[PDB]
Amino acid sequence: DINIDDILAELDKEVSPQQDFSDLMKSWKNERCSP
Amino acid sequence: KFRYMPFSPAGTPFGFTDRRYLTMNEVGYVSTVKNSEQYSITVSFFDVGRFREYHFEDLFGYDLCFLNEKGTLFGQSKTGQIQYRPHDSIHSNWTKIIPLQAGERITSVAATPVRVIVGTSLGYFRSFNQFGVPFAVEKTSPIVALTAQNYRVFSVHYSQFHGLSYSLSELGTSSKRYYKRECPLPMSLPNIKDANLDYYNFNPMGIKSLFFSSYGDPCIFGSDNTLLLLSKWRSPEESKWLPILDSNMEIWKMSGGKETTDIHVWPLALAYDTLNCILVKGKHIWPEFPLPLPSEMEIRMPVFVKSKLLEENKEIQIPVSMAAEEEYLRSKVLSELLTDTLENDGEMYGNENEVLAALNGAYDKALLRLFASACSDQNVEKALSLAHELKQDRALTAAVKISERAELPSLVKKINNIREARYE
Amino acid sequence: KFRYMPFSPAGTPFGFTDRRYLTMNEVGYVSTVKNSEQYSITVSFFDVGRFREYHFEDLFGYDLCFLNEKGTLFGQSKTGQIQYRPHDSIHSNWTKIIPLQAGERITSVAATPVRVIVGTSLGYFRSFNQFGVPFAVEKTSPIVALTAQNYRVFSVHYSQFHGLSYSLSELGTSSKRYYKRECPLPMSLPNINKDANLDYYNFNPMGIKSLFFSSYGDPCIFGSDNTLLLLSKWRSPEESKWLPILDSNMEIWKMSGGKETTDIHVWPLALAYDTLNCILVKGKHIWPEFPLPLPSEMEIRMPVFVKSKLLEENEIQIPVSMAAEEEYLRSKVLSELLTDTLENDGEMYGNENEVLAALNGAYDKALLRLFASACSDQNVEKALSLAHELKQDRALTAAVKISERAELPSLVKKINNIREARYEQ
Amino acid sequence: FRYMPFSPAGTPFGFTDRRYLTMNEVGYVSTVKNSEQYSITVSFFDVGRFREYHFEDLFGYDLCFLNEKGTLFGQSKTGQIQYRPHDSIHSNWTKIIPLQAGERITSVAATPVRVIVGTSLGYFRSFNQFGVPFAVEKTSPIVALTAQNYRVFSVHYSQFHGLSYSLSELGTSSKRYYKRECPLPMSLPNKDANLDYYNFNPMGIKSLFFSSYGDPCIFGSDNTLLLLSKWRSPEESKWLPILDSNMEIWKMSGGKETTDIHVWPLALAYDTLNCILVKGKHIWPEFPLPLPSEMEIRMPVFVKSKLLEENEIQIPVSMAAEEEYLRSKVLSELLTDTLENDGEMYGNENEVLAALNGAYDKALLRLFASACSDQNVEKALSLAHELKQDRALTAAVKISERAELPSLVKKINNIREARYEQ
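YS: structure for the whole thing
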């Protein structure tokens, strides 16, 4: 069939404390294990 | 030959054991233990913040029960004893014997914030206010099953001389109203294996449960393991039963086919679009005392042609045509139920209009995915008939874009006429 | 496999006695004696002061009958001959043949001052004016019993493919209305699975003893369960509901002293407001004998009583609280029925406002006895709910006085809140 | 219960490779065994508007329906359906429907707008005319279906529900059910020539259709045509047994109680049933299909014993006047109901109604003359109350003068005054 997933995407499209905590977790995990 | 038996929603038999459930629903569950010559009853709740579990020794051997927010109602089918127990215990308990002729039984009981209701195998329908004052006695076709939610009462009637039928009421503190009285019910009865025969000796109607949605729509789940919901019940000339979930089909699907058996669905409540149920496993159809967690099944409109799925799958993957058909139909019926709720009853939480908007988005998306297949076969008329169905003009632009990419200028032209008509 | 035997209200078998009744009614009764294999009709009346008896030979074998104020209607179930005989003779008698298809019977017939109706075992509903001109033909579920009053017709249907059901209809000037339309009927059938019972239910397998309108035009029926059902609020179909307003078997059990008598039976005639007019049959055969007992009466009584309490707490003497319950319910239902009659039909006898006021007095008095019972247990919530059910200020202040002597001030405050909220209107 | 497939006026095989699937106003459909393949023929009675064609069927379609815009086919056991427009510029389409274990399709129906399928488990599935599924609903088990424009008329039966019907219409805003699973007053059937048919169609519903003016009808095992009058107001609706074909066959057979001629219903068109008269051992039409024929609608007030006492059979004039009065009354009601709600269908109806009310009064006047010849004042006066036109009231007055009955003159003059003084 004719694919339309991009058409549906352009229709469907119409900082955070949680990301900061996740970045802290990433920083802690990277720091602990790196030389 | 047929026999009348006491019913309560989602209650279970004893079987080989010495304990069973009297009822279970969105509020909680009730269990009874054959403690030698007397019965230990435990009333347990799912919201343990609002309600505290309690238990008592029962010397009468109650076999009927109904549990709601304001209190528990009990009944002994053979002797006519009933008892009501408010949950706060600020209002008193009370007990009564209702009169039974020889061989008559209470077949079901129910309760309401200003009423208590008892129905019998000879069709007497006795009403008491919530403090036990007798208020009325009707006679109807025998009430084989019965429930309420808030003030809305929904009952199923049966006899060899009237057939299977239902009634729907809204009793209230004022403006006491009846929506439908003893209309025929399209549910399927069992064949009036031995474990099934044991259950149907306990419950000959095969009504595993009977309840209301969270938004107050009547629901019933019969021996065919198919959930039925009465849609547009508030306007009786338009009402219709929707088979919103064939649980045998969805069990066969989620198990990956294989004619999967010895797994059964035991329903508790629909919530909004998602049947809470215990999934029982093994030969017996009903749960054991350590009540498992009530697993969730989303409703599925029964459009799934099993042979087509067997051919494509020989874990099951669904063709997008079938998936979009089910998506379009499910989103339409759910949007209609939400619209009728919000018009007549209004929002109970603070997000139902937002849910309805999101659901309309899913509806138009399903229509576009079917429109694409119609355009792939270059069927201009089928595609145009689908184009009329879209609710959002903003989404109807996608029908234009698809018909352009399908090189169908006739579809583009006609859809542009609809764009202009919708703007105007 | 069922047999569509002919039916008429309160009619009886022959049994092994060649004298039989075709119908009985508040007007009178009809009987036949099978002399020389023809049928000497006898038509009799209970208010002899304005109707003459008369006697004649039916040579056709009329086995169906209806008796009304204005005349009597007959029918021969097999051949379809029917006959109308007015009770004066300013109007003529007349006779007609009705079409029967193969294997069909006329099942029942009825008449009023402005209509005549016939029903058959293949469900044909045929109707005529009082002079015998056909006015309509219609097909329905197989009509197995039938009755009528004024413009109103109440019919009962049964088959293996429709179930027991009923219809209620009324002729307007322009067109007929159906209030109820082959709706299921909550009456019990006889136990098809005792020799007198088997005789009667061979004569009448459907087990209806009689079905009739009240003195105020409410449909009623009396079946094998021996309880009088009345269809309340029939004037508003969505909310109409059958009331079992009398268990005559329970009342016979009471009057015989709490005794399981096999030897007294009630045969209905008509619901005159508070009372069922009836014949109290006695002995083995459960239908009236040739010398009729006089038209008796039972008061209607709601079936709230239970034997297990009547036996131990008590020719049986009712406890005061259980009596107050039944009085409350009976007053409630009759008050509603007369209110609806007054709103819909108006005064039919010119005194119903006073009867309704008397019922409301009995209603509030029954509630006051229940209120005293609740306050005797100091059940505040039950008593206050009962106080909401009272419907006149005199009774509300009496409830306050009963609360005061119950030393219960919470009720005193709350019922005075009711009083304030009501007299401020 | 058995739940065999149904289609309007279809027939069994009966140890014969040919059978009919449907018969209508527009035409008929038939199929032939072709080894394990089937041949199918679609044939038309209006060969001017439509064209006959064949096709070969590998699925074994046994349900069918024949709308003027297209034919619908269905396979009862396997659950496939197919739609074939007559304006073949519109594409055909095919859909496989979900059938559960032991389920069968029991009926199908089609319209210019909507396609309907019903099953032995009471699922009631709807599609638009291009095969887009528009709704799923559950009912008690469907045993028969028919449709016309937006309107749908279904029959249901179950051991746990009895025999019943629904009448529905798809409004643009919403669907409406005028009557919903209400009990249906048709007789089910009560030997081999009967058994061969009732093993194919155990309900004995020979056909199921709407009138030319859009009122539902059914034709059952009793061979009586039932029409649902005043269906547009359920508070007052009536099933009228407007024609007993056994009486007409007996009348036209000179009073012979023949089992050698039967009628097959095709469709009602005002005062005439289109039908096929069929003769011989089998009660259903055979391979060389006879021409369509007509019976006038004639209401069942005839008494057989009285007619053979009177006597081709000739009706005594009073009985004839009764039948004509009764039929003119009910048909006048149908025309008024249709013209008030649906409006003119073809533009002839408004004059037909006036002529029909003339016939109504003309029949009542023969009854009035009969009463006045018996000198029965009260019967005659009630008959005078039923008259419509002032010409008819004055004719009744002149009859009563001719009957030397002046009490009727005074009374009917006062009725005439009561009408014209307004």
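YS: worth flagging: The radius of gyration of chain D is 24 Å.
IM: good catch. Also Helices of chain D lie at 192-198, 245-252, 304-310, 317-341, 349-373, 377-385, 390-402, 406-420.
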